[PDB]
Structure 1
Amino acid sequence: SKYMTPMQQKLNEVYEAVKNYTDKRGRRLSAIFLRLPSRSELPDYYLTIKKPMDMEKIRSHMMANKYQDIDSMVEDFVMMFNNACTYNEPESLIYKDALVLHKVLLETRRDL
């Protein structure tokens, strides 16, 4: 087992910022984003969304050293939040959490 490369460390910092973000009430907005439900459980997502994405897929790719740069991981998160905001309506909580975590993601990015 190798120690994470310098790029994996920067990737991990972006990942953790999104994962660990809590609002003023202590709610961890990433909770619902960690693992997509199954096709059986959320069939309409799978009919609507061309490229499924969850944080577990991203974490696994990160830990495999498969991201070539920071922006490739950012793209996957952006895809995830866009999927969420396409499938769900602006009035839903998951939509608004996505917008908040999308902001958190870009802020973390700007600061690298």
Structure 2
Amino acid sequence: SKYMTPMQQKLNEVYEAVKNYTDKRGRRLSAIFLRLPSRSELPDYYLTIKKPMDMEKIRSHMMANKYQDIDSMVEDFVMMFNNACTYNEPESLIYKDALVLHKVLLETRRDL
């Protein structure tokens, strides 16, 4: 079944909060995180990041009704932002944006 159950609808609220967040200047910080480059495009990422994750993969898992609870999805987002902060250096834009969204995610969960 394709219909979103009540649990999926709650997961999708959290997913949308992260996806649609804009910073104080209107910048959509999620955009870079939708799609990780493939193994052929960025092989060194797959050497050191043991569990590659992007928001397309999370969303597909969510839409397939494969998350058992809100916490399971939050853990994949947390993994994704930790991966970004590991592969990318602290001076980088993506590292800074991963921190902001990681906090948005945690506060969204706490207030749910």
Query: TM-score per shorter chain, which class?
Result: over 0.9
Name stretches of at least 5 consecutive residues in structure 2 with no aligned partner: none
- Alpha carbons of 1:14 and 1:40: their partners in 2 closer, same or farther (altered >3 Å)? same
TM-score where L is the length of structure 2: 0.96
SS at 1:52's partner residue? Answer: coil
Hey, which bits of structure 1, 4+ residues long, moved more than 2 A? Answer: none
Tell me by how many angstroms 1:46 deviates.
1.0
| Residue ranges of structure 1 left out of the alignment (5+ in a row) | none
Question: Partner of 2:73 in structure 1?
Answer: 73
CA distance in 2, matches of 1:2, 1:63: 8
Query: Partners of 2:47 and 2:2 in 1: how far apart?
Result: 39
* Cα distance in 2 between the residues matched to 1:10 and 1:18: 13
Instruction: Measure how far apart 1:61 and its partner are.
Output: 0.5
- In the TM superposition, residue 36 of structure 1 has moved relative to its aligned partner by 0.6
The alignment covers a number of residue pairs equal to 112
RMSD: 1.0
Provide the rounded CA distance (Å) in 2 between the counterparts of 1:80 and 1:70: 16
Distance 2:103 2:4 in 1: 26
Give 1:91 deviation, angstroms. Answer: 1.0
Q: TM-score, normalised by structure 1?
A: 0.96
